[PDB]
């Protein structure tokens, strides 16, 4: 039940972006889900700060929060978008749209 | 009430590291606290994925979690630690120990 990449299919209409994104209608964004708690998994690539904070959280759970399972690497997708001239234009690498890797931070 | 760096003073004894860290006894680790919710602040440097996920969370709050306020840059501290030869040694830049910057991820 540890920090990992899971599916997350996003509809641009649902998030109000269909005003400018023509296509695609949906994409696989993924998400990072799971706990950052001891014992850790081999590949959650935990920073020292995440480790320290997790230990502090254990000792003081009402005052300090645990580390968070977040994207640590993102990948691009292509989008067809409306130009200011009102013309569909391809944005070939629209960066930061999809999770490549997750970790505790 | 947005994502930012706040104080977090860590005692190494409290987290079980006084077995190997001789000094210092405590340090300022900081932590990242606050919400990742619209409207965003100017300097939470949000990735596109964090923005998309936050919007999906709004539409589907029981199924998708919000973005997380995490460290996006860390700084070193110096520690005096016990060597395998049982001798105090300085580790001048012990990396990743203190928060330099926070953001939504
Ligand atoms: Cl562990
Ligand atoms: Cl680190
Ligand atoms: Cl491009
Ligand atoms: Cl290419
Ligand atoms: Cl881009
Ligand atoms: Cl905003
Ligand atoms: Cl981005
Ligand atoms: Cl060093
Ligand atoms: Cl130096
Ligand atoms: Cl180091
Ligand atoms: Na997957
Ligand atoms: Na959606
Ligand atoms: Na507490
Ligand atoms: Na290519
Ligand atoms: Na501060
Ligand atoms: Na402490
Ligand atoms: Na829901
Ligand atoms: Na120096």
Residue numbers in the entry:
A (entry chain A), B (entry chain A): 325 to 429
What text does the study give?
BMP-9 and −10 are synthesized as pro-proteins and processed by furin to release growth factors comprised of two cystine-knotted protomers that can covalently homo- or hetero-dimerize via a single cysteine in the dimer interface.
To further understand how these residues contribute to growth factor dimerization, BMP-9 G389S and BMP-9 G389S, K357R disulfide-linked dimers were crystallized at both neutral and low pH. For the crystals where the datasets were split, the integrated diffraction data was split using rebatch in the CCP4 suite to take either the first or last 32nd (or first 64th for wild type BMP-9) of diffraction images from each crystal’s 360° datasets. Where the arginine is present, the sidechain guanidino group sits between the serine and predicted backbone oxygen contact at the edge of accepted hydrogen bonding distances. Since wild type BMP-9 is radiation sensitive, the BMP-9 mutants were checked for radiation sensitivity. While neither mutant’s disulfide could be unambiguously modeled in a strained conformation, the radiation sensitivity demonstrates that the bonds are not ideal. Similarly, the double mutants further improve BMP-9 disulfide bond formation but fail to further impair BMP-10 disulfide bond formation.
